[PDB]
Amino acid sequence: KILKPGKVALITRGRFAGKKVVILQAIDQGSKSHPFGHAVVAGVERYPLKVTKSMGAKRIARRSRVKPFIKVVNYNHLMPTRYALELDNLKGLITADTFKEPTQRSAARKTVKKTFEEKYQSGKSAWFFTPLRF
């Protein structure tokens, strides 16, 4: 019961190892596609770089740009953390058809990236957006 929507966790398996993700939706009840403790998690593949006021606005935007990654991973693969991040734009956008339709997946990634950039601009969830050394 330690897994809830909007909770911050870390992925410990796969290509996106050691990347902080937020639980968009819990599928711990099990599913035919993933007969295990799977859940939809959205994380960051390229953490934003440090921003200097002397640098140009275009350069600052490029440094702050982050590439998100949305995938379903098992509960054992994930690692829950105390912190939790909740966003209005991240609620209700997760569905089976979203992962089923490739065009919907790209749209979801674009929406997640737009939401993350707004959060970075707002100066919130700095620990979550910051890359973790391992």
Partner: protein, 94 residues
């Protein structure tokens, strides 16, 4: 001795899982009321179990004996470094 007797009674009355993955699954599900970890457990495994127990609000019991001693107390012939008890059953170990 009283804790060992309560654990032995719970092993036949309540629900218990004696294993790393089973306890981790039980801790994740939150059903594991108490988690018994042997003193000979690895520091990384003990810390991971403690973090999971803290997140799931479960009791953390540290057995003085090693995994062999924990298995002998549980009555099984297999070493069990970590065990998870969800229900105490007739016993009042919880």
């Amino acid at each position: 001795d009283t804790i060992n007797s309560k654990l032995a009674l719970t092993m036949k009355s309540g629900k218990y899982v004696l294993g790393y993955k089973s306890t981790l699954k039980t801790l994740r599900s939150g059903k594991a009321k108490l988690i018994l970890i042997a003193a000979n457990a690895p520091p990384l495994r003990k810390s991971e179990l403690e973090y999971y127990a803290m997140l799931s609000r479960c009791s953390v019991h540290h057995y003085s004996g090693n995994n062999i001693d924990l298995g002998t107390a549980c009555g099984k012939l297999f070493r069990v470094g970590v065990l998870a008890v969800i229900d105490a059953g007739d016993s009042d170990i919880l």
